[PDB]
Amino acid sequence: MTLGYWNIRGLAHSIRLLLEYTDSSYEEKKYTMGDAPDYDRSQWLNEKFKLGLDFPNLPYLIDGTHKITQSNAILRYIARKHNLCGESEKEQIREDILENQFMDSRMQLAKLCYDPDFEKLKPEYLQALPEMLKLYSQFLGKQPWFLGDKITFVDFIAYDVLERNQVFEPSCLDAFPNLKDFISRFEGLEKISAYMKSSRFLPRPVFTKMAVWGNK
Amino acid sequence: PMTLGYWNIRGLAHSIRLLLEYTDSSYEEKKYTMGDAPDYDRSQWLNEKFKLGLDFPNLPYLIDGTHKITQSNAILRYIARKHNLCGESEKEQIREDILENQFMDSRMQLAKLCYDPDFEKLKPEYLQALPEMLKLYSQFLGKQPWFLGDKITFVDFIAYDVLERNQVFEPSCLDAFPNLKDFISRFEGLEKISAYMKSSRFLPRPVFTKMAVWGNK
Ligand SMILES: CC/C(=C/SC[C@H](NC(=O)CC[C@H](N)C(=O)O)C(=O)NCC(=O)O)C(=O)c1ccc(OCC(=O)NCCCCNC(=O)COc2ccc(C(=O)/C(=C/SC[C@H](NC(=O)CC[C@H](N)C(=O)O)C(=O)NCC(=O)O)CC)c(Cl)c2Cl)c(Cl)c1Cl
Known part of the structure; x- marks a missing residue:
């Protein structure tokens, strides 16, 4: 299972927390955005169209044969699996x-x-x-x-x-x-608490480098 | 019996209206009219917004008996779950x-x-x-x-x-x-779509609210 997103909190926070709560097995692919003024997105762009995604976007979830985009759809997928x-x-x-x-x-x-x-x-x-x-x-x-x-x-x-x-x-x-x-x-x-004490916990930056507040 | 509330435009209620038609649902519409620029008066809505028993008052809304729903997608899903859609x-x-x-x-x-x-x-x-x-x-x-x-x-x-x-x-x-x-x-x-589209109740325009630059009428 792989979770793809920018290296920030953003739209993935809820998904990360859910995967944790559900003791899901997964890996993250975390793309880096650049700064002003170019906001380089190279790593993402070089792979955006190579994932089999129907509607390429961040975040994405690859789970076996299923490839999902749209944060809410991702949450719902995980949720249905775990009776949440x-x-x-x-x-x-x-x-x-x-x-x-x-x-x-x-x-x-x-x-x-x-x-x-x-x-x-x-x-x-x-x-x-x-x-x-x-x-x-x-x-x-x-x-x-x-x-x-x-x-x-x-x-x-x-x-x-x-x-x-x-x-x-x-x-x-x-x-x-x-x-x-x-x-x-x-x-x-339990799980949330333990995540929160791990280095994987990623509460900030809230938003992308393009933000005026929360970019850092 | 069921009541659909929205501004007097296409907007976010288009899909809902079409679904209610397709499903041969019995409903009435409560149509709010926004005023023109520059004031863009919202009083028609605002006067009842907090009197409908909605948890999170908004447009569009659907009142169905005792279910009071806001959020376009939630409304669609509600209807859909009822009709195997x-x-x-x-x-x-x-x-x-x-x-x-x-x-x-x-x-x-x-x-x-x-x-x-x-x-x-x-x-x-x-x-x-x-x-x-x-x-x-x-x-x-x-x-x-x-x-x-x-x-x-x-x-x-x-x-x-x-x-x-x-x-x-x-x-x-x-x-x-x-x-x-x-x-x-x-x-x-x-069948039901075609017929609705020929009726005087069909509302394909204006696309957006009065505040829009394009599709305001
Ligand atoms: C972290 C920052 C984030 C970037 S994430 C990285 C990015 N991914 C990405 O964007 C994915 C987004 C995706 N959706 C997902 O995964 O969830 C990326 O880098 N991707 C990689 C590539 O390569 O692409 C970020 O900044 C961010 C960015 C985007 C988005 O979401 C995008 C989007 O468009 N989302 C859909 C809308 C969702 C939220 N909706 C609203 O906020 C409100 O919606 C509307 C409001 C008004 C309106 C009208 O103009 C109509 C007026 S209707 C009358 C009005 N009623 C309402 O407004 C009800 C709205 C309600 N939601 C409903 O549906 O009913 C009224 O008068 N009300 C009465 C009253 O009293 O208030 C016109 C007729 C419309 Cl049409 C809408 Cl839709 C997000 Cl989320 C983020 Cl975070």
């Missing part, structure tokens, strides 16, 4: 909603951090952020996990998005104990 | 997932272009990049009638919208790809 999915209709709906909701959240932060105008844009982001966090908080309520009593793939997505907001602005979650408690819970999982 | 084998599920997200990327690229003040300048570039993404969809589809194989599924609804709106942007974009052109025809030719 919503089961009831209601759980599936929630799963679907959150998967997409969290992608919107991811992207709002990414759009900010890659905008030349970052500093003029930040306070807006930060003023808006509590509103979204609040919805997440209220959704989660007193459940340990997003779907209920059981951990599922979306919690991996949730962790990444929420935690990185905490890294962006360390106080952002202060108004939401259940979200702080969620992060702790995630981090406290 | 999903991938079944593991391999089918993988492909469904990939395409769902791939077409979202495609959708977003076109929207980014279409809402950029630099549209004019940026268009040729989009047009130059387009056959490469379109080729990948053509390759993927191959000789299959539908994206997952011999059975129509939700992703074909997404595919239709994305591909067809590219054809609206640039009518010749699909020329090099017989299979894609045939896919379009086939989708359009589905």
Whole structure:
């Protein structure tokens, strides 16, 4: 099993954490991006079209005969294999909603951090952020996990998005104990804890070299 | 009984509307009208956004009895699971997932272009990049009638919208790809689709919101 991605956190964080939790056997291919102004992508470009991928992209997962692209598709593949999915209709709906909701959240932060105008844009982001966090908080309520009593793939997505907001602005979650408690819970999982004490753990840089925030 | 909420445009509800039609679903639409520039008034929505019991209030939304769903893809999946319009084998599920997200990327690229003040300048570039993404969809589809194989599924609804709106942007974009052109025809030719397309309820334009540079009307 091989995981391909840039040498940064980005869209692979959740996948890495999931492979770890699932005691999956895998190897990473980690491409290096260059700096400004050329942002050299040589190693990736020389192999992008040589992997058998239907829609070449980063991240990618090669598992035996299956070749997958699209972060969410990759997460879902792993998830289905390890019974880490919503089961009831209601759980599936929630799963679907959150998967997409969290992608919107991811992207709002990414759009900010890659905008030349970052500093003029930040306070807006930060003023808006509590509103979204609040919805997440209220959704989660007193459940340990997003779907209920059981951990599922979306919690991996949730962790990444929420935690990185905490890294962006360390106080952002202060108004939401259940979200702080969620992060702790995630981090406290045996496997997660042990990963986190390994050299493979890759929490930063959050974004690519092209970012204005998180490029380092 | 079921209620579909969205702005009074094509946008992200096109695929949903077409799926509800195909499935002979009983539904009503709640159509919100955005105001024109420069204010782009959102009050019609905003006045009820937080009164619908939605966990994460947004457009589009689907109210189905006691299920309250937001997120376009979630809505599609919900409908699809009800009507056997999903991938079944593991391999089918993988492909469904990939395409769902791939077409979202495609959708977003076109929207980014279409809402950029630099549209004019940026268009040729989009047009130059387009056959490469379109080729990948053509390759993927191959000789299959539908994206997952011999059975129509939700992703074909997404595919239709994305591909067809590219054809609206640039009518010749699909020329090099017989299979894609045939896919379009086939989708359009589905009984319930064909009929809907002839109705006064069909809403193919405007493509985007009032704030768009292109497709605003
Ligand atoms: C780490 C940084 C990262 C780079 S990773 C490296 C890169 N890979 C890569 O990009 C892979 C991405 C892929 N998708 C994946 O794997 O996941 C790489 O190097 N690759 C190698 C090569 O060689 O290529 C990074 O920066 C990054 C980059 C890209 C992306 O994602 C790309 C993308 O396009 N993703 C799809 C969109 C996902 C997220 N969606 C959104 O954020 C919001 O979506 C939309 C918003 C508006 C909009 C419209 O204009 C329509 C308006 S509708 C009315 C509106 N409702 C909504 O907005 C609802 C949206 C919701 N999601 C839904 O679907 O329902 C409204 O009025 N609402 C009401 C209200 O009150 O709010 C127009 C009609 C549209 Cl169309 C959309 Cl889609 C990512 Cl993620 C990252 Cl991180």
